[PDB]
Amino acid sequence: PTSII
Amino acid sequence: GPIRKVLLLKEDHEGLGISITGGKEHGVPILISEIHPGQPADRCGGLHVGDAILAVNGVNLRDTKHKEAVTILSQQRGEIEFEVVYV
Structure with missing residues (x-):
């Protein structure tokens, strides 16, 4: 799982 | 490598410019997987793909799940201190 912030 | 504390300046209208993977449920640190061009993390010059984010503004993220860390x-907001390490 990848998140962008 | 050694722990570094790195400052990033984020305007309210922009994101940090970082992709994140990892976290407690994966048995690995919160990890920087991408640094996006022109955004605060790129601009600060001190954050790199592969860095583990140990803490941000004195919040220890060494044992936190992905979602909560994110x-x-x-x-x-504003001037944000990242405690990072490239082991």
């Missing part, structure tokens, strides 16, 4: 990171 939420904490997303809540930070």
Whole structure:
């Protein structure tokens, strides 16, 4: 799982 | 490598410019997987793909699940201190 912030 | 504390300046209208993977449920640190060009993390010059984010503004993220770490990171404003390490 990848998140962008 | 050694722990570094790195400052990032984020305007309210922009994101940090970082992709994140990892977290407690994966048995690995919160990890920077991408640094996006022109955004605060790129501009600061001190954050790199492969860095583990140990803490942000004194919030220890060494043992936090992905979602909650991302939420904490997303809540930070202005001049933000990242404690990172490239082991």
